[PDB]
């Protein structure tokens, strides 16, 4: 459950990402592929080499989705409807993977927001990414 304070923390933090969102999303992915190699089984069609065009493109897409999520924090199920559908019926990514990407997103943020990444904001972002993950896998079964 995101409290009013969680929501403020997230908006602040994400406000700071601003224009770098796509660059951070690409970085988070690369961090995921390297640290949790099993996540690569979902991207057999991608060039996972460092700086790959598919990765950069995909990273922008993921980032934009998160940006939207932040913008509609109070209406996530509706905001992310197209993605919930897509993941649930086509992609079919096992739910454990979401926890892996979330961690790599948190690490990325931490490496880039020295001032903002306080323990309270860290807790808010962890909670926010868990909520996004829950929405995206809500139609699996």
């Amino acid at each position: 459950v995101l409290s009013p304070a969680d929501k403020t923390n997230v908006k602040a933090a994400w406000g700071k990402v601003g224009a770098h969102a796509g660059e951070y999303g690409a970085e988070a992915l690369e961090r995921m592929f390297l640290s949790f190699p099993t996540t690569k089984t979902y991207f057999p069609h991608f060039d996972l080499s460092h700086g790959s065009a598919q990765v950069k493109g995909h990273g922008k897409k993921v980032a934009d989705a998160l940006t939207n999520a932040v913008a509609h924090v109070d209406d996530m199920p509706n905001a992310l409807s197209a993605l919930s559908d897509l993941h649930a019926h086509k992609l079919r990514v096992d739910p454990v993977n979401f926890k892996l990407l979330s961690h790599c997103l948190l690490v990325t943020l931490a490496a880039h927001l020295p001032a903002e990444f306080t323990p309270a904001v860290h807790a808010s972002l962890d909670k926010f990414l868990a909520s996004v993950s829950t929405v995206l896998t809500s139609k699996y079964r």
Partner: protein, 146 residues
């Protein structure tokens, strides 16, 4: 893999009464029904939209047979699961692109199928022994992922 001499016996004794064919199709079918996202790998099997559809699919039945056949062979080598499953491990990763989490899910579904079938003979201690085995197998199969 740490199986006490007793656990080993318990595993062996029950397995001798198992009809792989039947059990394999049931384990693979239930997997597909309880955790529908696992259907992502079997598009070519046809319609897997209903439990009845899944459970009666012959492609599902044949695959369940193949899988449990291999499983069955590993029981013969609990001392070297890793070596025994190395090639299948590399195949699942490089060729099939199967998230190793699926191996854990199938292992838990398998245990449910043995309990369903065997009832009261599937005691807590027997389950614990099978729990160690399915984990050992899932681990052996995930071993060569990179």
């Amino acid at each position: 893999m740490h199986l006490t001499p007793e656990e080993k016996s318990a595993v062996t004794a029950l397995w001798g009464k198992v009809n792989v064919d039947e059990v394999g199709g049931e384990a693979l079918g239930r997997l597909l029904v309880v955790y529908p996202w696992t259907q992502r790998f079997f598009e070519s099997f046809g319609d897997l939209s209903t439990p009845d559809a899944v459970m009666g699919n012959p492609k599902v039945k044949a695959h369940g047979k193949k899988v449990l056949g291999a499983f069955s062979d590993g029981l013969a080598h609990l001392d070297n699961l890793k070596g025994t499953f190395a090639t299948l491990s590399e195949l699942h990763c490089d060729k099939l692109h199967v998230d190793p989490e699926n191996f854990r899910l199938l292992g838990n579904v398998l245990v449910c199928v043995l309990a369903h079938h065997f009832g009261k003979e599937f005691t807590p201690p027997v389950q614990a022994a099978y729990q160690k085995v399915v984990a050992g197998v899932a681990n052996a199969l995930a071993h060569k992922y990179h």
